[PDB]
Design an enzyme around this catalytic site. Structure first.
Site: not given
Ligand SMILES: N=C(Cc1ccccc1)N[C@@H]1O[C@H](CO[C@@H]2OC[C@@H](O)[C@H](O)[C@H]2O)[C@@H](O)[C@H](O)[C@H]1O
Ligand SMILES: *[C@@H]1O[C@H](CO)[C@@H](O[C@@H]2O[C@H](CO)[C@@H](O[C@@H]3O[C@H](CO)[C@@H](O)[C@H](O)[C@@H]3O)[C@H](O)[C@H]2NC(C)=O)[C@H](O)[C@H]1NC(C)=O
Ligand SMILES: N=C(Cc1ccccc1)N[C@@H]1O[C@H](CO[C@@H]2OC[C@@H](O)[C@H](O)[C@H]2O)[C@@H](O)[C@H](O)[C@H]1O
Ligand SMILES: *[C@@H]1O[C@H](CO)[C@@H](O)[C@H](O)[C@H]1NC(C)=O
Length: 475
Positions: A79, A125, A171, A311, A313, A384
């Site tokens: 992806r 994105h 997102e 996605n 997490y 993701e």
């Molecule tokens: N992280 C998100 C959702 C988000 C991101 C920033 C602020 C609020 C909510 N989504 C996915 O998580 C992946 C991991 O995101 C990380 O999550 C932990 C944060 O501290 C970090 O800054 C953020 O990049 C991103 O790299 C992808 O690009 C993205 O699609």
């Protein structure tokens, strides 16, 4: 040992990436500026260590060797996203197509396919061209829809003969909330009372932006279906993110608050996509700050996906927040809910290198079953799933990630259970392929199954998790 035969035949296992987070070459190859170039340079205080994506992983130059790594791991799919300003430097189609940008994506796609790896392409994105943000304020304006549609079309025309899985956008929740409520993401807008952004309104703009995001998505899907899908024979969808919401206590108050949080984060998008209307709780609590779909718009948005990208997490506990006489007007406070990773001082799961993120693999199943039951059993890809390490150890130590091995073991077992429960999951993508530029966290957080040595020539080293996946995939 636990392997891919536990999953449906032809299930797609892959890794994920995005253009601004991986590519670098931000001012090269004819590329124009995007809002993330602008944001990272003009607000270094909003990025950990004042980092940028100027170079990132330099995937733009290193893609050939990176594709060899994907093949080594044995992945079915990859992806990745298209940099809008790299292929259309002035944002508009009429501003001209950058031949050098098109060539890069063609080169990556051709290399991927030679290794038997299916490209899953995210059209948008978050890296909106600055020209469009400048012209009419980007997704604040209905003008964005036609430009988004033309961008999608360019992608279909140039790559659709080889690309058979399209994701309109990643997102839209993050784009709207991050960009216009909290001001944590580009373009960095929020209410003046936050003393955090030059411009904005956290109580109105996220709702304006989300409406235009859905309409842009819908325009791209309509064009694909009507003009390209019959002969290119691919599929098109959209990627959504949500936390899984667990009531903090057994009370009616916390139960309802949990569903409100899910309504505002997830339902904000999946109810329009499924029913052509926003959630009732949003209509009630946001009132006239929430745009209405016209009859034409509802018709365009409803049913506008072949598959859903999800996605996943984390899960959070949710507390009711009573109404108050003191209002900070914002999307964040509109839902009368408060998320927390702790209950009775006890974390919701195992810790990660990201302070807010704990491991709750059951939440993946719960979310999938909820989605199956509420939204007519849709086809789903997990676009993701992953965890981050704090970037505070040597390359040597970073490579050894048994915690990530554990993470993927547990989440794939949970995914297996979801499939057994009848959820139509067809694929699963690890975030991330490489340690990369993690938006507001810069390079302080490592999500990769492959380590990138930013201090020593951006060298790649497959982590223990990559080797675990290699064995899992019988490759
Ligand atoms: N992280 C998100 C959702 C988000 C991101 C920033 C602020 C609020 C909510 N989504 C996915 O998580 C992946 C991991 O995101 C990380 O999550 C932990 C944060 O501290 C970090 O800054 C953020 O990049 C991103 O790299 C992808 O690009 C993205 O699609
Ligand atoms: C690199 O940064 C990570 C941050 O994720 C550090 O790991 C974390 O260390 C803290 C403090 O030692 C751990 O929290 C504590 O855990 C103990 C025992 O489990 C608990 O009793 C304490 O109350 C506290 O919560 C945290 O779990 C851990 N996070 C992990 C492992 O993901 C690490 O120390 C840093 N390494 C170096 C070399 O600086
Ligand atoms: N605008 C730049 C500087 C830049 C580029 C990428 C990232 C950060 C900063 N360069 C110019 O962008 C142009 C396209 O982008 C336009 O730059 C002028 C802006 O006013 C306009 O909004 C933007 O679309 C390319 O056609 C030129 O070849 C190039 O010299
Ligand atoms: C893969 O898992 C199956 C169980 O479905 C097992 O029979 C087989 O031996 C496993 N193979 C490897 C190489 O682990």
């Amino acid at each position: 040992s636990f392997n891919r035969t536990s999953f449906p035949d032809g299930f797609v296992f892959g890794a994920a990436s995005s253009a601004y987070q991986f590519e670098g070459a931000a001012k090269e190859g004819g590329k124009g500026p995007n809002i993330w170039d602008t944001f990272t340079h003009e607000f270094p205080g909003k990025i950990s260590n004042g980092s940028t994506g100027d170079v990132a992983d330099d995937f733009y130059h290193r893609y050939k060797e990176d594709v060899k790594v994907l093949k080594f791991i044995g992945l079915d799919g990859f992806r990745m996203s298209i940099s809008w300003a790299r292929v259309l430097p002035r944002g508009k189609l009429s501003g001209g197509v950058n031949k050098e940008g098109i060539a890069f994506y063609n080169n990556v796609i051709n290399d991927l396919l030679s290794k038997g790896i299916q490209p899953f392409i995210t059209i948008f994105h978050w890296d909106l061209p600055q020209a469009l943000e400048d012209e009419y304020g980007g997704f604040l304006s209905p003008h964005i829809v036609n430009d988004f549609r033309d961008f999608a079309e360019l992608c279909f025309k140039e790559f659709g003969d080889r690309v058979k899985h399209w994701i309109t956008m990643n997102e839209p929740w993050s784009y709207s909330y991050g960009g216009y409520d909290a001001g944590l993401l580009a373009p960095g807008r929020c209410s003046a009372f936050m003393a955090f952004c030059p411009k904005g309104n956290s109580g109105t703009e996220p709702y304006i932006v989300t409406h235009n995001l859905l309409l842009s998505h819908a325009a791209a899907v309509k064009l694909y279906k009507e003009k390209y899908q019959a002969y290119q024979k691919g599929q098109i969808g959209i990627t959504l993110v949500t936390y899984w919401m667990i009531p903090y206590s057994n009370s009616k108050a916390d139960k309802d608050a949990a569903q409100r949080a899910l309504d505002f984060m997830y339902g904000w998008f999946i109810e329009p996509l499924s029913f052509g209307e926003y959630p009732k709780s949003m209509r009630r609590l946001v009132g006239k700050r929430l745009p209405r779909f016209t009859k034409e718009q509802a018709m365009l948005v409803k049913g506008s996906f072949d598959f859903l990208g999800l996605n996943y997490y984390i899960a959070n506990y949710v507390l009711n927040v009573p109404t108050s006489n003191s209002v900070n007007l914002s999307y964040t406070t509109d839902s009368l809910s408060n998320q927390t990773a702790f209950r009775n001082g006890v974390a919701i799961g195992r810790p990660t290198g990201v302070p807010a993120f704990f491991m709750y693999p059951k939440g993946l199943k719960d979310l999938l079953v909820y989605t199956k039951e509420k939204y007519n059993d849709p086809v789903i890809y997990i676009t993701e799933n992953g965890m981050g390490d704090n970037n505070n150890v040597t390359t040597e130590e970073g490579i050894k990630d048994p915690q990530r091995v554990y993470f993927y073991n547990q989440h794939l077992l949970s995914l297996k259970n979801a499939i057994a429960a009848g959820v139509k999951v067809k694929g699963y993508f690890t975030w991330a392929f490489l340690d990369n530029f993690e938006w507001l966290s810069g390079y302080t957080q490592r999500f990769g199954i492959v380590y990138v040595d930013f201090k020593d020539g951006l060298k790649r080293y497959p982590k223990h998790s990559a080797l675990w996946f290699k064995k899992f995939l019988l490759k």
